[PDB]
């Protein structure tokens, strides 16, 4: 769990008051070598009945089911990863699958088909540099998605802005209102500052990471 590292990285950037000091030189904090490998491109909240389905940017699809199990279909459309409630990981294929997983596979295929047909692909214009969804929650303002590689993604509903936080790179990717996809080193935002918009979202992010840490 790299959540503690993430919280520390956010504590540090926020404490530097990046938008409240001198000349903001945000462009100097950009680091394309830190562009994430994975993020959530689409999601469907069917948690009142089945669970939460998501598409990663590589076109792989996962579901976190209401029974606390996870099923992930690789982008080849056949290879499967199943994670039981106790945490046991199994690797198989749809072509071979146990009869006991037929229902969950079918559900996943419906999720997959819907996302492929109906939703915008977040970061669609970007070539990325397999994690599963550890957990998620929603607020009035955002959906928060925690990936098993330590990444935390926050999608804001009102303005469609998004953060992808990676504690391994100590980086943040910001997708703005114009769908501009920019990756920054957090330490460099400390060094060079950032706009009020990103600064406010990083403050929000800290609160969300606290929530993740307090509900582990």
């Amino acid at each position: 769990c790299h959540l503690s590292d993430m919280l520390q990285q956010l504590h540090s950037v926020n404490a530097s008051k990046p938008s409240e000091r001198g000349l903001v030189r945000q462009e100097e904090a950009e680091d394309p070598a830190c562009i994430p490998i994975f993020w959530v491109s689409k999601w469907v909240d069917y948690s009142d009945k089945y669970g939460l389905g998501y598409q990663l940017c590589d076109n792989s699809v996962g579901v976190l089911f209401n029974d606390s199990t996870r099923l992930i279909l690789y982008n080849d459309g056949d290879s499967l990863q199943y994670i039981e409630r106790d945490g046991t990981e199994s690797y198989l294929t749809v072509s071979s699958h146990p009869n006991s997983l037929m229902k969950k596979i079918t559900l996943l295929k419906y999720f997959r088909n819907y996302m492929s047909e109906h939703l915008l692909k977040a970061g669609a214009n970007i070539t990325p540099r397999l994690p599963y969804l550890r957990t998620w929650f929603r607020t009035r303002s955002a959906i928060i998605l925690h990936l098993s590689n330590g990444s935390v993604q926050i999608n804001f509903f009102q303005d469609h802005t998004k953060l992808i936080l990676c504690p391994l790179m100590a980086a943040v990717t910001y997708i703005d209102e114009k769908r501009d996809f920019r990756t920054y080193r957090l330490s460099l935002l400390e060094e060079y500052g950032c706009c009020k918009e990103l600064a406010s979202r990083l403050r929000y992010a800290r609160t969300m990471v606290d929530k993740l840490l307090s509900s582990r």
Partner: peptide, 7 residues
């Protein structure tokens, strides 16, 4: 609340 991401 929106039950899915942006269309």
């Amino acid at each position: 609340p929106p039950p899915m991401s942006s269309m």
